[PDB]
Amino acid sequence: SMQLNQYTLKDEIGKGSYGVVKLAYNENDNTYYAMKVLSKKKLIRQIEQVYQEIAILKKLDHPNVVKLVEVLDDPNEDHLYMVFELVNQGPVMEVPTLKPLSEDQARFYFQDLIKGIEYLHYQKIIHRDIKPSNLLVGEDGHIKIADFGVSNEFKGSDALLSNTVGTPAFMAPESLSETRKIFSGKALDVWAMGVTLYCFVFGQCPFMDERIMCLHSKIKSQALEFPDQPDIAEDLKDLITRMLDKNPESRIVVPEIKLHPWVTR
């Protein structure tokens, strides 16, 4: 352990896109928090993107998004600390797994994910790393979205993006072109939500390959296939298929997802 003002840092509870997350005991109020720890020296090798993330996080207040509580940043020290609310049960699942969620459990969590993403997009944030391991289950059984390390703020109705970040298996095909292109940010989050929902019920990603180039090729050019087990409802298959439409112009949007019959039953 190690003391940091009123906090006692304990075991590591996650990695993430940048830095690590540690359990932290707060002596003043007698409870635990989650603390993201960053090295400025390590960031400088791999400043203002961190303060961009902090400005994003300070804007967000929703029950399905993890709350930033405070930031501890001494210009003397190499480490920067971001204190978040702790969400007890941690990630909803690891992928791959042989114990996927039931349809009913998946629907419950997906409903939380819709509300969270809808909120983020309203606040003009693209998350860019939606996946099961970034969705934390609270004491009340609801999910909270975490890890804004590669998230983008935009102006107007959508982000116009040209860079590829996040977790390879969750990247939309339009973001994997060989030549520089521009693509819509909201549709990227929808694609990642579709990969996430597939993972919820099958316990594995729809496109997988150990070789990065082949994974990209599959995401771009392999038709979606459902595994043999478990069997799932027709309406869930339809929803997943529409979220993993390779054409971002025809891909289902969040207002349409909210009205899908799998979501509303």
Ligand SMILES: COCCOc1ccc2c(c1)ncn2-c1ccc2cccc(N3CCC(N)CC3)c2n1
């Ligand atoms: C069995 O799990 C025990 C609890 O685990 C966690 C793990 C992370 C937690 C958390 C609880 N309560 C809040 N967070 C936060 C709070 C802020 C974060 C900022 C950036 C990245 C995070 N994660 C999310 C989980 C992922 N698997 C690793 C990186 C963050 N996670």
